[PDB]
Amino acid sequence: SGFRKMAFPSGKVEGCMVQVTCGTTTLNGLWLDDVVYCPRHVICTSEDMLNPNYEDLLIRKSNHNFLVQAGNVQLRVIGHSMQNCVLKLKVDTANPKTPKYKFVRIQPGQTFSVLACYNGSPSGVYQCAMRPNFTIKGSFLNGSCGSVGFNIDYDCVSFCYMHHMELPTGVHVGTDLEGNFYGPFVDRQTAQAAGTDTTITVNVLAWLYAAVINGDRWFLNRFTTTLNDFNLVAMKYNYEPLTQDHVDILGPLSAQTGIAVLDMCASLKELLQNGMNGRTILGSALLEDEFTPFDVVRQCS
Amino acid sequence: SGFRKMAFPSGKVEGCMVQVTCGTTTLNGLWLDDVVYCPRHVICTSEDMLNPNYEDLLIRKSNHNFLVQAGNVQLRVIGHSMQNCVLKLKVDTANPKTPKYKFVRIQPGQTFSVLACYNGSPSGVYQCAMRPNFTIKGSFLNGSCGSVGFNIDYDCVSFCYMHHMELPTGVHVGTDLEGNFYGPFVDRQTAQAAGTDTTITVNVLAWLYAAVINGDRWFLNRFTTTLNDFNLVAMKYNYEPLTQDHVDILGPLSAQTGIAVLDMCASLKELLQNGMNGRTILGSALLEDEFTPFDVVRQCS
Ligand SMILES: *C(=N)[C@H](C[C@@H]1CCNC1=O)NC(=O)[C@@H]1[C@@H]2[C@H](CN1C(=O)[C@@H](NC(=O)C(F)(F)F)C(C)(C)C)C2(C)C
Ligand SMILES: *C(=N)[C@H](C[C@@H]1CCNC1=O)NC(=O)[C@@H]1[C@@H]2[C@H](CN1C(=O)[C@@H](NC(=O)C(F)(F)F)C(C)(C)C)C2(C)C
Structural domain boundaries, residue A268: 201-300
Q: How far is CA A139 from CA A240, A289, A293, in A?
A: 26, 18, 24
The DSSP letter of residue B281 is B
Q: What does the DSSP 8-state code read for residue B70?
A: E
H helix count then E strand count, chain B:
8, 13
Spatial separation of the C-alpha atoms in residues A94 and A32, rounded to whole Å: 7
Experimental method used, please?
Answer: X-ray
Kindly list the residues from chain B whose CB atom is less than 8 angstroms away from the CB atom of residue A170. 1-2, 214-215
Beta bridge partners of B100: B156
Mutate to test the pocket of ligand 2, among B181, B189, B190, B192 (most ligand atoms within 8 A of CB): B189
- Do B84 and B170 share a domain, yes or no? yes
Count up the domains in chain A and report the number.
2
Q: Which residues pair with A122 in a beta bridge?
A: A117
Q: Which of A13, A111, A126 to mutate to test the interface with B (most CBs of B within 10 A)?
A: A126
Whether residue B191 lies inside any domain: the answer is no
Q: Is A59 on the interface with B (CB under 8 A)?
A: no
Residue B92 is which amino acid?
A: D
Which residues is A283 bridged to in the sheet?
none
Residue B242 lies in a domain: yes
> What is the number of other CB atoms lying within 10 angstroms of the CB of residue B203?
24
Q: Do A157 and A215 share a structural domain?
A: no
Tell me if A74 is assigned to some domain: yes
The answer as to whether B48 is a domain residue is yes
| Helices B261-274 + B201-213 axis angle, to 10 | 100
B48 lines ligand 2 (CB under 6 A): no
Record: contact A3-B140, CB cut-off 8 A:
no
- Whether B287 and B216 map to the same domain: the answer is yes
Q: Which helix (H) or strand (E) holds B81?
A: strand B77-83
| B42 φ/ψ angles, rounded to the nearest 5 degrees | -75, -30
- The Å distance, Cα A164 to ligand 1 centre, comes to 7
**Nearest C-alpha neighbor of B260 from the set B216, B299, B301, B230:** B230
Shared domain for A169 and A248, answered yes or no, is: no
Per-residue H/E/C for A160-202: EEEEEEECCCCCEEEECCCCCECCCCCCCCCCCCCCCCCECHH
Separation in Å, CA A112 to CA A133, A175, A238, A244, B244: 16, 13, 23, 24, 41
- Regarding beta strands A66-70 and A17-22, do their DSSP bridges make them parallel or antiparallel, or are they unpaired? antiparallel
Cβ-contact A68, A59 below 8 angstroms:
no
For B124, the closest chain A residue by CA position comes to: A8
The answer to whether A139 contacts chain B (CB < 8 Å) is: yes
Residues of B in contact with A139 (CB under 8 A): 1-4, 6, 299
| Same domain (yes/no): A166, A24 | yes
Cα distance between residue B275 and residue B58, in whole Å: 55
C-alpha B300/C-alpha B214 separation (Å) is 8
> Which region, left, alpha or beta, applies to residue A92 given φ > 0 means left and ψ of -120 to 50 means alpha?
alpha
Indicate whether A168 and A40 sit together in one domain.
yes
CATH code where residue A165 lies:
2.40.10.10
**CA-CA distances (angstroms) from residue B11 to A11, A105, A177, B280?**
4, 25, 22, 35
Position A167 in a domain: yes
Task: Quote the distance between the C-alpha of residue B78 and its chain's center.
Answer: 31
Torsion from C-alpha of A168, B213, A124, A93, nearest 10 degrees: 60
Task: Please answer yes or no on whether A124 and B3 come within 8 Å at the CB atom.
Answer: no
Please name the residue whose Cα sits nearest to atom 23 of ligand 2: B189
Residues 150-169 of A with CB under 8 A from B: 166
A-B CB pairs within 8 A amount to 110
d(CA A118, CA A124): 10
Cα Rg of chain B (Å, integer) = 22
Distance CA A255, CA A260 (A): 8
Chosen domain end from A116, A140, A175: A175
3-state secondary structure of B110: coil
CB of B143 within 6 A of ligand 2: the answer is yes
Residue among B139, B166, B281, B282 with most chain A CBs within 10 A, to mutate: B139
Q: Is B69 exposed, middle or buried (0-12, 13-18, 19+ CB in 10 A)?
A: middle
| Spatial separation of the C-alpha atoms in residues A136 and A127, rounded to whole Å | 10
- Rounded Cα distance, A61 and A26, in Å: 15
How far does A6 lie from chain B, in Å, by closest CA? Answer: 5
What is the CB neighbour count within 10 angstroms for residue A205? 27
Q: Which CB contacts under 8 angstroms, 24+ apart, belong to A223-231? A: A223/A263, A223/A266, A223/A270, A224/A260, A224/A262, A224/A263, A224/A266, A225/A262, A225/A263, A225/A265, A225/A266, A225/A269, A226/A262, A227/A262, A227/A265, A230/A262, A230/A265, A230/A266, A230/A268, A230/A269
Beta carbons within 8 Å of B55's beta carbon, 6+ residues apart: B82
Q: How far is CA B142 from the centre of its chain?
A: 19
- DSSP, collapsed to helix, strand or coil, labels residue B229 as helix
- Centre of ligand 2 from the C-alpha of residue B8, in Å: 26
The helix/strand/coil state of B127 is: strand
Which residues of chain A neighbour B7 with C-beta distances below 8 Å? 7, 124-126
Amino acid at position B222, single letter = R
From the alpha carbon of B189, which atom of ligand 2 is closest? 24
Q: Which residues fall within 8 angstroms of residue B73, CB to CB, at 6 or more apart?
A: none
For ligand 1, atom 12, which residue shows the shortest CA distance? A165
Helix (H) or strand (E) holding B59: helix B54-59
CA A144 to CA B177: how far, in whole Å? Answer: 34
Which positions in chain B touch A123 (Cβ < 8 Å)? 6, 9, 298
Cα(A68)–Cα(A25) distance, rounded to whole angstroms?
A: 12
B255 and B154 within one domain? no
Longest dimension (CA), chain B: 69
Reported as type and span, the H/E element at residue B66 is strand B66-70
Amino acid A215 reads G
Residues B134, B240: one domain? no
| Strand order through the sheet with A73-75 | A73-75, A66-70, A17-22, A25-32, A35-39, A86-91, A77-83
Distance A40 CA to ligand 1 centre (A): 12
- Mutating to test ligand 1, I would choose from A24, A27, A43, A189 the residue with most ligand atoms within 8 A of its C-beta, which is A189
Q: Is the CB of B145 under 6 A from ligand 2?
A: yes
Query: Could you tell me if A110 and A292 are in contact, meaning their C-beta atoms sit under 8 angstroms apart?
Result: yes
Residues A184 and A40: their CA atoms lie apart, in Å, by 17
Q: Would the CB of A49 count as within 6 Å of ligand 1?
A: yes
Reported resolution, Å: 2.4
Residues A168 and A225 in one domain: no
3-state SS, residue B160:
strand
Q: Is B165 a member of any domain?
A: yes
CATH of the domain at B276: 1.10.1840.10
Exposed / middle / buried, residue A149 (Cβ in 10 Å: 0-12, 13-18, 19+): buried
Report CA(B170)–ligand 2 centroid distance (Å).
Answer: 11
How crowded is the C-beta side of A23, counted as CA atoms within 13 Å?
12
Give residues with Cβ within 8 angstroms of A73, minimum separation 6. none
Among residues A128, A120, A132, the alpha carbon closest in space to that of A19 is found at: A120
Nearest C-alpha in B relative to A167: B1
Task: Verify that A77 and A156 share a domain, yes or no.
Answer: yes
Per the DSSP assignment, residues forming a β-bridge with A80 are A89
Give the rounded distance of the alpha carbon of A163 from its chain centre: 9
CA distances from B101 to A217, B12, B25, B98, B153 (A): 43, 10, 28, 8, 10
CA torsion through residues A5, A8, A13, A14, sign: positive
Angle at CA of residue A32, ends A31 and A35, nearest 5°: 70
Q: Tell whether A126 lies on the interface with B, counting CB pairs under 8 A.
A: yes
Confirm whether B283 is domain-assigned: yes
Q: Is the CB of A181 under 6 A from ligand 1?
A: no
Question: How far apart, in Å, are the Cα atoms of A8 and each of A5, A93, A157?
Answer: 10, 28, 10
CA dist., res. B297 & res. B254, Å (int): 11
Question: Which residue of B125, B141, B216 to mutate against A (max A Cβ within 10 Å)?
Answer: B125
d(CA A45, CA A62) in angstroms, rounded, equals 16
- Of all ligands present, the nearest one to the C-alpha of B188 is 2
Report the alpha-carbon distance of residue B66 to residue B90 in Å, rounded.
11
Is B41 annotated as catalytic? yes
Assess whether the C-beta atom of B47 lies below 6 angstroms from ligand 2: no
Residue of A37, A72, A43, A70 lying closest to A55 (CA atoms): A43
Radius of gyration of chain A (CA): 22
* Residue A36 shares a structural domain with residue A76: yes
Length of chain A: 301
The C-alpha atoms of residue B187 and residue B204 are separated, in whole angstroms, by 32
Examine the domain organization and report whether A162 and A16 are in the same domain: yes
Residue at A120 is within a domain: yes
B146: left (phi over 0), alpha (psi -120 to 50) or beta: left
Question: For the residues of B15-32, what is the DSSP string, one character each?
Answer: TTEEEEEETTEEEEEEEE
- By the 8 A CB rule, do B161 and B172 touch? no
DSSP chain A: ------B--THHHHTTEEEEEETTEEEEEEEETTEEEEEGGGG--TTGGGS--HHHHHHT--GGGEEEEETTEEEPEEEEEEETTEEEEEESS--TT--EEEE--PPTT-EEEEEEEETTEEEEEEEEE--TTS-B-----TT-TT-EEEEEETTEEEEEEEEEEE-TTS-EEEE-TTS-BSSS--SSSS--------B-HHHHHHHHHHHHHTT--TT--S----HHHHHHHHHTTTBPPPPHHHHHHTHHHHHHHT--HHHHHHHHHHHHHH--TT--BTTBSS---S--HHHHHHHH-
Q: Is A1 in the pocket of ligand 2 (CB under 6 A)?
A: yes
Q: What is the dihedral of CA A157, A158, A164, A165, to 10 degrees?
A: -110
Give the Cβ contact number of residue B33 at 10 Å.
13
- State the Cα–Cα distance between residues A105 and A107, nearest whole angstrom: 7
Measured distance CA(A219)–CA(A212) in Å, rounded: 9
Q: What is the Å distance from ligand 2's center to B4 Cα?
A: 30
Order of strands across the sheet that contains B73-75: B73-75, B66-70, B17-22, B25-32, B35-39, B86-91, B77-83
